[PDB]
Amino acid sequence: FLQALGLLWFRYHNLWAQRLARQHPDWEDEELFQHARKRVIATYQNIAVYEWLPSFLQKTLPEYTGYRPFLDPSISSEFVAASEQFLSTMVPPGVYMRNASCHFQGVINRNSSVSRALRVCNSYWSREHPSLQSAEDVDALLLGMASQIAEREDHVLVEDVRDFWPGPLKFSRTDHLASCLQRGRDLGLPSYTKARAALGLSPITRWQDINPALSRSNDTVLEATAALYNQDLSWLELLPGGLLESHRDPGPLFSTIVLEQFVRLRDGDRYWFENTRNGLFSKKEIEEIRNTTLQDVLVAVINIDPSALQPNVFVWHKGDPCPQPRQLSTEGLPACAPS
Amino acid sequence: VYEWLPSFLQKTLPEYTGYRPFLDPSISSEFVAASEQFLSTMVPPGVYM
Amino acid sequence: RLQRLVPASYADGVYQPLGEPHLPNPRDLSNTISRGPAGLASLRNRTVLGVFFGYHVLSDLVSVETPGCPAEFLNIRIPPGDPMFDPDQRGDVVLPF
Amino acid sequence: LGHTFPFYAGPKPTFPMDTTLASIIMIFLTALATFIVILPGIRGKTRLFWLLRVVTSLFIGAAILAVNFSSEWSVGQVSTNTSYKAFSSEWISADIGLQVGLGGVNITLTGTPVQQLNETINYNEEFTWRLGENYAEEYAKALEKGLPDPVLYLAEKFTPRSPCGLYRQYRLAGHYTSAMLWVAFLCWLLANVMLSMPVLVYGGYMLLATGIFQLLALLFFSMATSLTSPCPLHLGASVLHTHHGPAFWITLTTGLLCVLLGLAMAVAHRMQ
Amino acid sequence: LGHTFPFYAGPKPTFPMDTTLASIIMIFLTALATFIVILPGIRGKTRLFWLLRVVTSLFIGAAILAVNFSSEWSVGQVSTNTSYKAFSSEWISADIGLQVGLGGVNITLTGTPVQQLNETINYNEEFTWRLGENYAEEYAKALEKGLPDPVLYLAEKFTPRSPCGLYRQYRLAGHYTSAMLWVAFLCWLLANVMLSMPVLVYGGYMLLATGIFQLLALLFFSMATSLTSPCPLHLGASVLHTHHGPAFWITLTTGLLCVLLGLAMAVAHRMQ
Amino acid sequence: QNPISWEVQRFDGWYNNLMEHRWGSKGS
Ligand SMILES: *[C@@H]1O[C@H](CO)[C@@H](O[C@@H]2O[C@H](CO)[C@@H](O[C@@H]3O[C@H](CO[C@H]4O[C@H](CO[C@H]5O[C@H](CO)[C@@H](O)[C@H](O)[C@@H]5O[C@H]5O[C@H](CO)[C@@H](O)[C@H](O)[C@@H]5O)[C@@H](O)[C@H](O[C@H]5O[C@H](CO)[C@@H](O)[C@H](O)[C@@H]5O)[C@@H]4O)[C@@H](O)[C@H](O[C@H]4O[C@H](CO)[C@@H](O)[C@H](O)[C@@H]4O[C@H]4O[C@H](CO)[C@@H](O)[C@H](O)[C@@H]4O[C@H]4O[C@H](CO)[C@@H](O)[C@H](O)[C@@H]4O)[C@@H]3O)[C@H](O)[C@H]2NC(C)=O)[C@H](O)[C@H]1NC(C)=O
Ligand SMILES: *[C@@H]1O[C@H](CO)[C@@H](O[C@@H]2O[C@H](CO)[C@@H](O[C@@H]3O[C@H](CO[C@H]4O[C@H](CO[C@H]5O[C@H](CO)[C@@H](O)[C@H](O)[C@@H]5O[C@H]5O[C@H](CO)[C@@H](O)[C@H](O)[C@@H]5O)[C@@H](O)[C@H](O[C@H]5O[C@H](CO)[C@@H](O)[C@H](O)[C@@H]5O)[C@@H]4O)[C@@H](O)[C@H](O[C@H]4O[C@H](CO)[C@@H](O)[C@H](O)[C@@H]4O[C@H]4O[C@H](CO)[C@@H](O)[C@H](O)[C@@H]4O[C@H]4O[C@H](CO)[C@@H](O)[C@H](O)[C@@H]4O)[C@@H]3O)[C@H](O)[C@H]2NC(C)=O)[C@H](O)[C@H]1NC(C)=O
Ligand SMILES: *[C@@H]1O[C@H](CO)[C@@H](O)[C@H](O)[C@H]1NC(C)=O
Ligand SMILES: *[C@@H]1O[C@H](CO)[C@@H](O)[C@H](O)[C@H]1NC(C)=O
Ligand SMILES: *[C@@H]1O[C@H](CO)[C@@H](O)[C@H](O)[C@H]1NC(C)=O
Ligand SMILES: *[C@@H]1O[C@H](CO)[C@@H](O)[C@H](O)[C@H]1NC(C)=O
Ligand SMILES: *[C@@H]1O[C@H](CO)[C@@H](O)[C@H](O)[C@H]1NC(C)=O
Ligand SMILES: *[C@@H]1O[C@H](CO)[C@@H](O)[C@H](O)[C@H]1NC(C)=O
Ligand SMILES: *[C@@H]1O[C@H](CO)[C@@H](O)[C@H](O)[C@H]1NC(C)=O
Ligand code: NA
């Protein structure tokens, strides 16, 4: 699926190179490659910052006011954990493969069985898959991911991530959340309270104030987590606190981290496509890039009618084309390969 | 910052909104010339006691 | 190097990570927090395509997965009787990290 | 055995002393052990005198080498409460010691107790001003490294540009004291070689020269380190005072022993 | 004369060639001049043969040394238009040359004309992968230094982590070729020494060994640089192709001359 | 209790910024 995204961007670059070759027949290889790379980078930045971020944070960057040469844009250590966790909390147990005519095809397993969707845990580092053989299969992957709803933005992880993540050493499987916790301890990440204080967030003094709606319900995860920490809120780590904070959105800590990191990335970059001083694009080219969404990239690469995809492929709404058959769970999918 | 600068620039700093850990505060090369010249243009021939 | 919002939190204040018994076992914390039923739809109807596009954006931005030199191991001690990694109650299973 | 990482999980050892001094001690103790093994092969009554001669010569050589390489000429040590590191307001109670040698200075910061603020405070840092080595570069690398505040303070106290001129005088003193100590070592080697030869009076003269050069190095170090303007080293609520360390006194004692033995040799030759 | 600063206002000179090659040439030309001065002292008819022997031996030694130290084994050169520096969209028309030797690579960027964009473009940078030297550190220092873009591109092409495996194969080839060239130099020295001695057949055998080791170094360089996966070096609108440089051909010619002379010596000894 | 309850500012400008220790320092 990450591979499908990479293939999408690779084919988009090739398509832009072909377009520029059509427009400028006299251009050589280097000129075509550089112009296509510039355009693709601009489109990627626009989609990532002005379309994906507002949809997956419910927060928008402030209006671009120019290039800040004195602003450090380096990725913060907290951003790694925040982004990784608020993405891992939404990984589905399976992924649909969808036709351009709103038809969800069956997925041929390596066990020769036909499943309703492609199981995530059994597709890690897949050298080859029987249902993934041609460009049409990758297009089906992209369409199905566009039509399928992700998992809930909560503390719960699917077993494909929590138990069957690719083990990098001596085990074919490992816990991705435990690995992320050990990464946060490895990077010397701050405590949850210190992280909140450094970002200007309001201090949290009680364990039930981490997520009021979570403590309202019958879920006992807050009390159990406090028991693990010996009721010491000052020892709660940034990553578990960000996991617990999330409710319908990344928590205030994680949302603040990601938003501030992306603000610094946009403002501190001299090659940002909106920075008119770098000479990358004219005003008209900047306006064209701003008008380009991921739906445009998918339509251009897959070469299908625009009505086959919703206008904002990052969010599915009632009335959008090709609804998913049902919310995927572990039921009906192949069992994950044992460690 | 809050008394000499407003009086000798007729410009005031924006309201202090906190510490910016990611902002480079190093003196720019242009600042040397700018400050030195707008101070040297006001040196009097003599000074009273 | 990566930036820091807060000064680094290490056991020795330089490079040694904070771990047990001061902090809970990573697998215990994972089991306590992340165990739950699959199939809970996103409350904003966010799509899977968006999730993996964000994964692509992260791969574009940061990468701290490849190990460093010299090889230092911060191994995850699996609690005895873990249903997934220690099903035989052997009590010495260790996930290498 | 495998299946676990790392294969060796034990803490890695740290050498318990200076490696140069340890090597000198090992070499000269090996020579002493060899000659002790050889001792029964010595002929007759001239064994205790032979033992004294051999042990004295080996001690003179070891003293020359160790003193020339010891950073223990000007020593000082004070127990204080001081700020420890950056981005931390906590203070540490520690012994801060200065050990200025011929080629540089060792700054020691030993916690009392060593385990303070969940950290091991047993720093022993060297900053060298030997010819060809840039002291300012070493101090800049220490600043980049992030050494604790007392160490950085005492290191910048010896920078070439520091207002108190410790660097210039101490570099000059150490350089010429080391040169004259090397001359004394050469004279000691020649003293052994020419005590092997039948002309004992020339060997006694060379031993006398060894003593004279030791005394000259001692006097030069004293005079060149005395010309310093008083640099007040203030840590916390205390002031650190330096004084002639045991390297200075070992130089004095060894030089006096060498000059006394040389004078005795010359007078005995004149009287016999 | 004073009263003005600086006392010398002239541009400072730059040495017009490689200092190692220049030193080798100077030393061997000095030896040649000394032996030419000595030539009238040679007895009789055995002067032209003596001259040929001396000049041939000196040429063999100079070839060994210069080739071992020349960064001219794999050479390439292309004229292109390329981006020059950062924060500047202007391009330069220049000859970019790659000169891979045994211990490293010299990247040359010569402007056409040299004076372009109000700058002198005559860069000749070396990046060394010799044992004990860190190529990645040198490339990082070049990046910090701010070298022009073609130089940085061709330098990163030889980094250990670059996707095209030029670094590994070229380091191995250069290391072992240099080792065998040093063996050939030792054999040449022994060939001279044992041609001084009455046993001429052994000296001829040593000369034959010199030739054999030169050929072995040549063959090893060829084989180890042939195992490279094709690294496409693309600058601007062109591709740079490397080929065996004049160091390779001088190695071949000198080794063939040495093996031919050794075979001639052995066959003449057998026939006389 | 120590009257100096804060981290004393350095005279050379080092360690003022958390990640850029040379910022504002002497010689920068
Ligand atoms: C005059 O002064 C002279 C100069 O000191 C003196 O000569 C010196 O003599 C001593 C012997 O008496 C020798 O120097 C010592 O050597 C020891 C061993 O050196 C090897 O190991 C170190 C350790 O490296 C590990 O850790 C670092 C991080 O700290 C990692 O980056 C490494 O990768 C490595 O990590 C692995 O191993 C760890 C082991 O537990 C694992 O935990 C980890 O997971 C990894 O597996 C290496 O760094 C050394 O390499 C360096 O040097 C070589 C050659 O120079 C370089 O090529 C290389 O690039 C490196 O630069 C080497 O391999 C050192 O351990 C010891 O260092 C301590 O002391 C010095 C001096 O005070 C400090 O600067 C240094 O930071 C260390 O102090 C800390 O640690 C000690 C205990 O470990 C504490 O007591 C101390 O308070 C301080 O603690 C603080 O930091 C800790 C983290 O670092 C933290 O945990 C604490 O809480 C606290 O904050 C020392 O250098 C050597 O012979 C001479 N030194 C030279 C030549 O430089 C001379 O005797 C003096 N004269 C007289 C008369 O006294
Ligand atoms: C394989 O490769 C090997 C490596 O190259 C090669 O071995 C090398 O051989 C050459 C001889 O053939 C030797 O290297 C050369 O040495 C020359 C002399 O070196 C001395 O002088 C330099 C100059 O320093 C002055 O300028 C700098 C700024 O540039 C100042 O920082 C200095 O303070 C000094 O300034 C004073 O003098 C100026 C003179 O006009 C005054 O104007 C000024 O006001 C001041 O009064 C010193 O830097 C040298 O010191 C360095 O090295 C020592 C020892 O290593 C260190 O201790 C020390 O710290 C320094 O690091 C030394 O004292 C060099 O001039 C020459 O450098 C040029 O070429 C190299 C390689 O391309 C470039 O990297 C370098 O930048 C220079 O290129 C610029 O300048 C030339 C002409 O000057 C241009 O043609 C060129 O295009 C480039 O111009 C660009 O920059 C200019 C500004 O720099 C700018 O004006 C232009 O417009 C343009 O932008 C070179 O290094 C030496 O023997 C070997 N090199 C080694 C060992 O490093 C080997 O032969 C090769 N093999 C084969 C087979 O070919
Ligand atoms: C897939 O879509 C195409 C047209 O988009 C349609 O012709 C085809 O029948 C569909 N596949 C199936 C299995 O119905
Ligand atoms: C961008 O889209 C808006 C409306 O969606 C349109 O008014 C505008 O002309 C477009 N600009 C470009 C450059 O395509
Ligand atoms: C979210 O998607 C489901 C189908 O998975 C649909 O029934 C529901 O109406 C959607 N909600 C919104 C607000 O679009
Ligand atoms: C250091 O502080 C402790 C406790 O605050 C005190 O007992 C001790 O006397 C202090 N030492 C110095 C040298 O000030
Ligand atoms: C720090 O030191 C205190 C007291 O010496 C000790 O109780 C604690 O376990 C140590 N470690 C941490 C992480 O606080
Ligand atoms: C470089 O540019 C000049 C002028 O633009 C042109 O004449 C020349 O052919 C170009 N060379 C290459 C190799 O493209
Ligand atoms: C730069 O080059 C141009 C043309 O070669 C020349 O006229 C000019 O004097 C040079 N110097 C500057 C500062 O422009
Ligand atoms: Na979830």
PDB file of N, CA, C and O in Angstrom, chain D residues 104-126:
ATOM      1  N   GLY D 104      50.192  19.870  29.538  1.00  0.00           N
ATOM      2  CA  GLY D 104      48.781  20.187  29.591  1.00  0.00           C
ATOM      3  C   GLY D 104      48.285  20.173  31.023  1.00  0.00           C
ATOM      4  O   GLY D 104      49.070  20.189  31.973  1.00  0.00           O
ATOM      5  N   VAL D 105      46.962  20.146  31.153  1.00  0.00           N
ATOM      6  CA  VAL D 105      46.307  20.177  32.454  1.00  0.00           C
ATOM      7  C   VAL D 105      45.174  19.159  32.473  1.00  0.00           C
ATOM      8  O   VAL D 105      44.416  19.031  31.505  1.00  0.00           O
ATOM      9  N   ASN D 106      45.075  18.421  33.576  1.00  0.00           N
ATOM     10  CA  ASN D 106      43.959  17.523  33.839  1.00  0.00           C
ATOM     11  C   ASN D 106      43.028  18.177  34.853  1.00  0.00           C
ATOM     12  O   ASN D 106      43.448  18.529  35.961  1.00  0.00           O
ATOM     13  N   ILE D 107      41.768  18.335  34.469  1.00  0.00           N
ATOM     14  CA  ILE D 107      40.726  18.863  35.338  1.00  0.00           C
ATOM     15  C   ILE D 107      39.859  17.693  35.776  1.00  0.00           C
ATOM     16  O   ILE D 107      39.316  16.962  34.937  1.00  0.00           O
ATOM     17  N   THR D 108      39.749  17.502  37.085  1.00  0.00           N
ATOM     18  CA  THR D 108      38.976  16.417  37.666  1.00  0.00           C
ATOM     19  C   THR D 108      37.743  16.981  38.355  1.00  0.00           C
ATOM     20  O   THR D 108      37.822  17.981  39.072  1.00  0.00           O
ATOM     21  N   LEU D 109      36.607  16.332  38.127  1.00  0.00           N
ATOM     22  CA  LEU D 109      35.345  16.676  38.777  1.00  0.00           C
ATOM     23  C   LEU D 109      34.782  15.378  39.342  1.00  0.00           C
ATOM     24  O   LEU D 109      34.225  14.566  38.597  1.00  0.00           O
ATOM     25  N   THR D 110      34.956  15.165  40.645  1.00  0.00           N
ATOM     26  CA  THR D 110      34.516  13.941  41.302  1.00  0.00           C
ATOM     27  C   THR D 110      33.363  14.273  42.238  1.00  0.00           C
ATOM     28  O   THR D 110      33.533  15.040  43.189  1.00  0.00           O
ATOM     29  N   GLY D 111      32.199  13.686  41.975  1.00  0.00           N
ATOM     30  CA  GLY D 111      31.046  13.953  42.808  1.00  0.00           C
ATOM     31  C   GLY D 111      31.222  13.413  44.215  1.00  0.00           C
ATOM     32  O   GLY D 111      31.946  12.447  44.456  1.00  0.00           O
ATOM     33  N   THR D 112      30.541  14.057  45.161  1.00  0.00           N
ATOM     34  CA  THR D 112      30.527  13.641  46.563  1.00  0.00           C
ATOM     35  C   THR D 112      29.078  13.567  47.022  1.00  0.00           C
ATOM     36  O   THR D 112      28.535  14.546  47.554  1.00  0.00           O
ATOM     37  N   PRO D 113      28.411  12.416  46.833  1.00  0.00           N
ATOM     38  CA  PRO D 113      28.933  11.170  46.261  1.00  0.00           C
ATOM     39  C   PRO D 113      29.045  11.203  44.739  1.00  0.00           C
ATOM     40  O   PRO D 113      28.533  12.126  44.108  1.00  0.00           O
ATOM     41  N   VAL D 114      29.717  10.200  44.170  1.00  0.00           N
ATOM     42  CA  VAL D 114      29.909  10.152  42.723  1.00  0.00           C
ATOM     43  C   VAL D 114      28.565  10.096  42.007  1.00  0.00           C
ATOM     44  O   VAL D 114      28.386  10.697  40.940  1.00  0.00           O
ATOM     45  N   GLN D 115      27.599   9.383  42.582  1.00  0.00           N
ATOM     46  CA  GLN D 115      26.264   9.263  42.001  1.00  0.00           C
ATOM     47  C   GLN D 115      25.408  10.423  42.498  1.00  0.00           C
ATOM     48  O   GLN D 115      24.849  10.372  43.596  1.00  0.00           O
ATOM     49  N   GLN D 116      25.308  11.474  41.686  1.00  0.00           N
ATOM     50  CA  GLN D 116      24.446  12.613  41.967  1.00  0.00           C
ATOM     51  C   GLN D 116      23.609  12.935  40.738  1.00  0.00           C
ATOM     52  O   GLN D 116      24.069  12.789  39.602  1.00  0.00           O
ATOM     53  N   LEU D 117      22.374  13.377  40.981  1.00  0.00           N
ATOM     54  CA  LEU D 117      21.442  13.758  39.917  1.00  0.00           C
ATOM     55  C   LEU D 117      21.256  12.627  38.907  1.00  0.00           C
ATOM     56  O   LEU D 117      21.105  12.865  37.707  1.00  0.00           O
ATOM     57  N   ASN D 118      21.273  11.385  39.401  1.00  0.00           N
ATOM     58  CA  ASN D 118      21.156  10.187  38.567  1.00  0.00           C
ATOM     59  C   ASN D 118      22.254  10.118  37.510  1.00  0.00           C
ATOM     60  O   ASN D 118      22.039   9.609  36.407  1.00  0.00           O
ATOM     61  N   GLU D 119      23.442  10.626  37.836  1.00  0.00           N
ATOM     62  CA  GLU D 119      24.562  10.627  36.907  1.00  0.00           C
ATOM     63  C   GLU D 119      25.837  10.260  37.652  1.00  0.00           C
ATOM     64  O   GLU D 119      25.941  10.425  38.869  1.00  0.00           O
ATOM     65  N   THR D 120      26.811   9.757  36.898  1.00  0.00           N
ATOM     66  CA  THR D 120      28.121   9.400  37.432  1.00  0.00           C
ATOM     67  C   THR D 120      29.069  10.566  37.181  1.00  0.00           C
ATOM     68  O   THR D 120      29.415  10.856  36.031  1.00  0.00           O
ATOM     69  N   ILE D 121      29.491  11.233  38.253  1.00  0.00           N
ATOM     70  CA  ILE D 121      30.352  12.403  38.129  1.00  0.00           C
ATOM     71  C   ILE D 121      31.767  12.031  38.552  1.00  0.00           C
ATOM     72  O   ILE D 121      32.128  12.145  39.728  1.00  0.00           O
ATOM     73  N   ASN D 122      32.575  11.585  37.592  1.00  0.00           N
ATOM     74  CA  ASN D 122      33.967  11.215  37.827  1.00  0.00           C
ATOM     75  C   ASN D 122      34.830  11.690  36.665  1.00  0.00           C
ATOM     76  O   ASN D 122      35.683  10.958  36.154  1.00  0.00           O
ATOM     77  N   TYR D 123      34.608  12.927  36.229  1.00  0.00           N
ATOM     78  CA  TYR D 123      35.281  13.434  35.041  1.00  0.00           C
ATOM     79  C   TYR D 123      36.768  13.641  35.294  1.00  0.00           C
ATOM     80  O   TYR D 123      37.171  14.129  36.352  1.00  0.00           O
ATOM     81  N   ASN D 124      37.583  13.286  34.298  1.00  0.00           N
ATOM     82  CA  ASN D 124      39.031  13.522  34.327  1.00  0.00           C
ATOM     83  C   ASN D 124      39.442  13.906  32.905  1.00  0.00           C
ATOM     84  O   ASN D 124      39.820  13.047  32.104  1.00  0.00           O
ATOM     85  N   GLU D 125      39.398  15.203  32.610  1.00  0.00           N
ATOM     86  CA  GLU D 125      39.596  15.707  31.256  1.00  0.00           C
ATOM     87  C   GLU D 125      40.993  16.290  31.105  1.00  0.00           C
ATOM     88  O   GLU D 125      41.513  16.919  32.027  1.00  0.00           O
ATOM     89  N   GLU D 126      41.599  16.092  29.939  1.00  0.00           N
ATOM     90  CA  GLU D 126      42.908  16.661  29.655  1.00  0.00           C
ATOM     91  C   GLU D 126      42.808  17.698  28.547  1.00  0.00           C
ATOM     92  O   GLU D 126      42.123  17.489  27.542  1.00  0.00           O
TER      93      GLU D 126
END
